[PDB]
Amino acid sequence: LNNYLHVFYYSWYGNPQFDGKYIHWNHPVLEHWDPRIAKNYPQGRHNPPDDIGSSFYPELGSYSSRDPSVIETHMRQMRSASIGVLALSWYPPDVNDENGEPTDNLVPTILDKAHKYNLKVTFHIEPYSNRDDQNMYKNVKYIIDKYGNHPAFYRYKTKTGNALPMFYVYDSYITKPEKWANLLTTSGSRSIRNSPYDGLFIALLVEEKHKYDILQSGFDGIYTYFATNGFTYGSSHQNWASLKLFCDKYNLIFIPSVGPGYIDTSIRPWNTQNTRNRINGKYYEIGLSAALQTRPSLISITSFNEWHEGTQIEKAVPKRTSNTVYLDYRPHKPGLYLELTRKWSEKYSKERATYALD
Numbered sequence: 001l002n003n004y005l006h007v008f009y010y011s012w013y014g015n016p017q018f019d020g021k022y023i024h025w026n027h028p029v030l031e032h033w034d035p036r037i038a039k040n041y042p043q044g045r046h047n048p049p050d051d052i053g054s055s056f057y058p059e060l061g062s063y064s065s066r067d068p069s070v071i072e073t074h075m076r077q078m079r080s081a082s083i084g085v086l087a088l089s090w091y092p093p094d095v096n097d098e099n100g101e102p103t104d105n106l107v108p109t110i111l112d113k114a115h116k117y118n119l120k121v122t123f124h125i126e127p128y129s130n131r132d133d134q135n136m137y138k139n140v141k142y143i144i145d146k147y148g149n150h151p152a153f154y155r156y157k158t159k160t161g162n163a164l165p166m167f168y169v170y171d172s173y174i175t176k177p178e179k180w181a182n183l184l185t186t187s188g189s190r191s192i193r194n195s196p197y198d199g200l201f202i203a204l205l206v207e208e209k210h211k212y213d214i215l216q217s218g219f220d221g222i223y224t225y226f227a228t229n230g231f232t233y234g235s236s237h238q239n240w241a242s243l244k245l246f247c248d249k250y251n252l253i254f255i256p257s258v259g260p261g262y263i264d265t266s267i268r269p270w271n272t273q274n275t276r277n278r279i280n281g282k283y284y285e286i287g288l289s290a291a292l293q294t295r296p297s298l299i300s301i302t303s304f305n306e307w308h309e310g311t312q313i314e315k316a317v318p319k320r321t322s323n324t325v326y327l328d329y330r331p332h333k334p335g336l337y338l339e340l341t342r343k344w345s346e347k348y349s350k351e352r353a354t355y356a357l358d
């Protein structure tokens with residue numbers, strides 16, 4: 001199991017049988033900012049189970065994230081891909097993404113199932129409204145006190161035997177560096193540095209200029225998230241050598257994010273510019289290769305199951321309805337991306353063993 005390979009995981013899917021209604025599968029079409037443009041595209045919520053807010057269709061159907069057999073299947077798949085860690089999309093208790101319901105209540109269950117498969121769970125902190133240094137302090141504390149003693153709680157284990165929580169902070173650039181510095185610098189007014197609540201905070205780099213903001217904020221690392229090559233400076237793998245060099249100079253953990261493709265046009269029909277064909281696994285393999293070449297301390301995978309954005313490596317199956325032919329992994333099997341991950345994970349694991357100065 002490769003503990004240096006992290007995958008972005010989403011627990012926001014629901015169905016009537018487990019949640020009392022569809023959640024996320026019935027995603028609305030997101031309106032373009034200009035309503036003159038939006039009026040020429042589809043509108044309203046998708047209608048599961050045959051019409052979902054994805055360009056692909058899961059082997060598990062319009063599943064519930066809260067179904068314990070679904071969680072087990074997911075853990076099996078990640079273990080068989082040789083992924084050691086899932087980075088769980090997270091909102092604070094009683095808060096949720098704008099298209100979903102609260103998910104913090106499910107964390108204990110996900111931890112238990114992860115433990116069953118020797119997997120670890122870290123946290124991908126989403127941009128909840130009014131997220132700032134004050135409430136991030138409280139949420140970090142909350143996460144560590146509540147889940148920190150679970151044996152599947154992820155900690156980056158240094159060779160020195162220190163073991164630090166990790167937090168990926170999505171769209172961290174929304175909060176000013178002077179606010180972050182309150183939490184993340186040694187002498188910030190509400191610093192968690194050197195407290196029992198210390199950890200490795202990874203910032204999302206979008207634009208090149210964010211490099212500098214990230215230094216000023218006191219983050220420990222950078223990640224790039226987006227699966228589309230060319231969408232941002234960070235998501236373009238031509239720039240990963242430079243980011244790696246920068247991170248090395250400044251003692252930051254570089255975590256490039258690699259994806260198998262992208263397509264979100266079931267929910268963002270205006271966003272065809274960022275669509276990337278999977279090329280029967282070759283897009284993913286080019287990403288994985290480009291990441292391995294930078295000799296990174298960790299690699300992240302976008303994603304296990306962001307089905308709206310078509311970046312999932314979770315098992316997908318052919319499906320045709322009266323008006324839709326879903327995308328799929330034909331001519332390969334539903335486990336294609338799991339197999340390709342296992343291959344590159346073992347390369348990365350063997351190569352990463354020879355990075356060390358000792």
Ligand SMILES: OC[C@H]1O[C@H](O[C@H]2[C@@H](O)[C@H](O)[C@@H](CO)O[C@@H]2O)[C@@H](O)[C@@H](O)[C@@H]1O
Nearest residue numbers: 171206226228231232264268271274309
């Ligand atoms: O606009 C489409 C775009 O939206 C989402 O990402 C948003 C935000 O979270 C990102 O930080 C910035 C990066 O420039 O872009 C958007 O504002 C994603 O769903 C993305 O894949 C999509 O293309």
Ligand SMILES: OC[C@H]1CNC[C@@H](O[C@H]2O[C@H](CO)[C@@H](O)[C@H](O)[C@H]2O)[C@@H]1O
Nearest residue numbers: 089097098099100124126170306308309
């Ligand atoms: O986890 C980081 C990031 C990944 N992409 C989706 C982002 O959420 C946003 O878009 C989805 C649809 O793709 C919506 O369902 C969410 O409400 C919205 O916040 C997510 O933050």
Ligand SMILES: [Mg+2]
Nearest residue numbers: 158251252253
């Ligand atoms: Mg060091």
